[PDB]
Chain A
Amino acid sequence: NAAARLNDITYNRLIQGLKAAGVEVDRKNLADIAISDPAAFTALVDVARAALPEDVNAPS
Chain B
Amino acid sequence: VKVNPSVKPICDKCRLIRRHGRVMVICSDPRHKQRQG
A and B touch in the complex (CB under 8 A): no
